[PDB]
Design a protein around this nucleic acid. Structure first.
Ligand code: MN
Length: 108
DNA sequence: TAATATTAC
């Protein structure tokens, strides 16, 4: 698994972490480049189970080399990892159901 | 892409 991107769009299905607790763990990820913006939202699956979406904007492009680098812990929570094609589309998408938290400053 | 999974611009 390989991604080189400035902006990451993450989706954690069947995830019971609070949005604040997931934001906390992602803030404390040691990455070479600095995180300028993290937004985490909590939404519900059709069966009532919660999941999270995350937008991370890094200061520069970040080479993800490992499919588990963004795994979170309470059980272990594994996300769908994609490079955000549009940071502004994702920002809107993460905000749409109203239950989200931000860290940092949104970029460009 | 893996590896959560129907959730993912
Ligand atoms: Mn959702």
């Amino acid at each position: 698994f390989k991604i080189y991107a400035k902006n990451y769009f993450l989706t954690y299905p069947n995830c019971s972490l609070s949005k604040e607790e997931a934001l906390s763990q992602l803030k404390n990820l040691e990455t070479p480049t600095n995180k300028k913006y993290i937004k985490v939202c909590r939404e519900l699956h059709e069966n009532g189970e919660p999941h999270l979406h995350v937008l991370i904007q890094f200061e520069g492009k970040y080479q993800c080399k490992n499919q588990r680098f963004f795994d979170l812990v309470s059980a272990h929570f594994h996300p769908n990892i994609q490079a955000a094609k549009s940071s502004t589309d994702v920002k809107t998408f993460v905000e749409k159901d109203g239950d989200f938290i931000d860290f940092g400053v949104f970029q460009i």
